[PDB]
Amino acid sequence: XXXXXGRXXXXXPXXXXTXXVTXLXXXXXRXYLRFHXXXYXXXXXXX
């Protein structure tokens, strides 16, 4: 019906500023250290 010259345009529904736009194509119209290895009792203990 609406198809024009081999083009299948059929599958279409047919029934501030106020600009006007064209329809169908819109455009303007833990762990804490332990004592060892912490450097005491490694220089100490006079007993």
Partner 1 sequence: IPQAHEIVIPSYSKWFNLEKIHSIEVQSLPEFFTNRIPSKTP
Q: Report the C-alpha gap between 8 and 6 in whole angstroms.
A: 6
Q: Which is nearer to partner 1, 28 or 46 (CB)?
A: 28
- Quick one: DSSP state of residue 11? S
Q: Which residues bind partner 1 (CB under 8 A)?
A: 16-24, 26-29
**Residue 24: both structure tokens together:** 């169908």
Q: Which is nearer to partner 1, 25 or 31 (CB)?
A: 25
Shortest CB 19 distance to partner 1, Å: 6
Q: Tell me which residue of 11, 24, 33 sits closest to 41, measured CA to CA.
A: 33
Q: Which is nearer to partner 1, 21 or 33 (CB)?
A: 21
